[PDB]
Amino acid sequence: SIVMTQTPKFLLVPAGDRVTITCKASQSVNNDVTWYQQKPGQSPKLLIYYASNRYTGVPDRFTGSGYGTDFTFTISTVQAEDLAVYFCQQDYSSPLTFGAGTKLELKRTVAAPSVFIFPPSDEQLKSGTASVVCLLNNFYPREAKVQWKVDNALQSGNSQESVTEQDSKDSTYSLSSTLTLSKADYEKHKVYACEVTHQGLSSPVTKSFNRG
């Protein structure tokens, strides 16, 4: 099949910057190139067709160009809402094939997380397990270190975390970490703490509670 080679794989720019993405077809595909945008949690949307035509309703900051093998897609001034994977498609001949995508990331100013801790609910405690949740909200950049401590003892192997995609309005991330203990173990300790290290903080922030 025809291979579409899309570069770069990732772009990181502040709002207002221009970007150009490239797709190179492995053979001539004339003008049979389409560009789509896929925002987090949404299906792809059509932006450009026949290489250079904007689809109805698409903002004029989006353009495309090319004929033959070398195709580009340009955002003249990137906006926060443009956080998305952009991908090209050829339909010169079957099968339709797609580039591997370019993830457009928004650079914004450093923002320290707001840190919140949640004890297990009494509802969960009835069931025999205890989940403690630490939330790091609306921070930038994405890198962050979360350490769980129970009665000042560092925990390992009993927590999991995940991070949202960048927010489409403020360009921040959030992170949720869950410490999972048996109810019996939870009820043998007092102080539950999550300690957060992040480039927006001058020293680590610890949020804690005393069981009971």
């Binding site: 498609q89 797609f98 919140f116 939330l135 991070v163 869950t178 999972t180």
Partner: protein
Amino acid sequence: EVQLQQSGPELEKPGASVKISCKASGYSITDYNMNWVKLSNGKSLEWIGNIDPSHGGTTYNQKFKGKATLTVDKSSSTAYMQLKSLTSEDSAVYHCARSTLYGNSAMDCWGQGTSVTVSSASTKGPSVFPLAPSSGTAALGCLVKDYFPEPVTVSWNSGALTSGVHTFPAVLQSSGLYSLSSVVTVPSSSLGTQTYICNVNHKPSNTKVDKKVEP
């Protein structure tokens, strides 16, 4: 007013089959081609094939011949894709999307996607626990624990609350079960005067839970 409405998520055992539907409204399905595409976690989008809904002709990507069968029920304006002989390689999100009948295949309207998980593990519905706000912005949430397969949906206040919501990617526990949290930040002043309820749906287990999150 054009919409493509796909059937819900499905858990299937290896070796089984699944038939995904894609109902067209706001236009006549026979006026446009219908395409199907696959997206596996951490892979590139792949085109499965197309169908002319008016007269039924099909083109398949050779990679999917013997795996996918495309049909249309004109009377109900519904396109179908049957996936046969399922393996873990078929776990993915599948979309239908329309394009012109006689021209280019720029896909201008897409269905919402259908998640298919192929696994021998049994379905399990989640438990939903409050993340209660406590000691001018407050955070609260719901913990959606121990379900299989993905996905779940979470809304707040029946969709009336969207600002400040963060629903996190699920994590897979050693038990083979997923867990996720959904949080929202709100004005502290609202905790005694605004109700906060998370609405959780895990369609594969027919689980629907509304949980009030009390300060």
